[PDB]
Amino acid sequence: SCNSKGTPCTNADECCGGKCAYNVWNCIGGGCSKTCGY
Numbered sequence: 615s616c617n618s619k620g621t622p623c624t625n626a627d628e629c630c631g632g633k634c635a636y637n638v639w640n641c642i643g644g645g646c647s648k649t650c651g652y
Contacts, residue, residue: 621650 616630617623623634631652638646 617650619650619652622647623650624648 617628618630619633621628623629626632626634628634629650629652631650633651634648635651636643636646636648
């Protein structure tokens with residue numbers, strides 16, 4: 615059970631590829647929503 619890119623998560627495990635993290639310019643690390651890369 616995994617997820618795909620563009621999907622919200624809290625850990626890399628949530629991503630079949632292992633790329634869980636948020637990438638924003640107006641969302642400093644600390645209260646954001648990480649997304650899948652692969």
